[PDB]
Amino acid sequence: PEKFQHILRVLNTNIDGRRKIAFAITAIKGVGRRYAHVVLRKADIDLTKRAGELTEDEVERVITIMQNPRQYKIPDWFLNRQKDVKDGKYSQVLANGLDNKLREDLERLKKIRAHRGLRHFWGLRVRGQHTKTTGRRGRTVGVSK
Template sequence: MPTGKNVEVELSLPKEIKHVVRLAKTDLDGTKKAAFALLKIPGINIRFAQAVLKAAQINPSLRLGELDDSQLKKIEEIIQNPVKYNIPYWMVNRVKDLQTGEHLHICGSDLFLKFKEDIDNMRKIKSWKGIRHALNLKVRGQHTRTTTRGGATVGVSRKKVKSGS
C-alpha cells in the first residue's frame, strides 16, 4: 500500500442506473444503496428499510437505481401495507389506528398530517397532553422551572458599594 501519495479510487456504477428514483411520493438518490436511499422517505428508519428489502427479497447491497420497475413497485406495496407481507406489527409507526383499528405505516407528508390530527384530537378531548400542547408547555413531564421561559431576560440590580469602609 503506497503511503503519502494520493490514490484515486474509482467507483464502478453500472451504465444503466437511474439517478433519481420516485418512491412513496419522494425523490430518492438512485446511486445510494437501497436501504440507505429509503431513509430519505419520512417515516422510514433503517430497521424498517431493511425489513422491507428482506420481505421483497432484494439484495440490500444493490443500488436503488439498479432495481427494475417491478422491484420498485413491490417495495412501494410493502411500504404501504407491511403487515400483509409478514413485517411484524410492532415495526409500523401507527399500531392500532384510532379511526380504523388497523396496523398502518404512514410515510411522507401524510405522516405530518396525521401527527397534527393526533395533537388536535388530544386538544379536543382535553387530555393532559392536549392541554399541555394547547398551552405551549412541555408535554412529557420535563421540568419547566428554568427552561421554556418566555419574554425578555431580566437582569439583577446590585446595591451600590460604599467607598471608604
C-alpha cells in the first residue's frame, strides 16, 4: 500500500489512481482501450497494478511515449490523424488539441460553403440518414385555429 497518492494530473486532466493502469489513462481524450494497451506494452509496464502504484519516472515514460508514437515503433495504421490536410503529417492528437482539430475541420468546410458545412451549420443530420421520424427535439404542435 504505502498510502501513496491516489489522484494524479497527467495532461491538463485528472486520473483516478484507483483503477487498473490500462483503464485509468483512457480518461485522456484521444486514448481508447485499444491504444492504451499498446502504449503500456511499449513502455514496459506490468498491466496488473493500480494506477496509484506507478513511480514518478514511470508516468514520465508513459507521457513521453503517448506524445511521440512513431519513434517507439507504433504503426502508422494505428493513428487518429493520417496525412493531415494542411501539412501531410501522421500523428495522434490528444486532450485540448483534439477539440481545436475538429474546430478547424468544421470551419474549413463552412468557408468554401460545401454541402457538409451547410448541414453542420443548420444543425441537421450530416451523413446519409432520413429526417421524417427520428432525431425529434422540439415540442408537439396542435391542429386548432
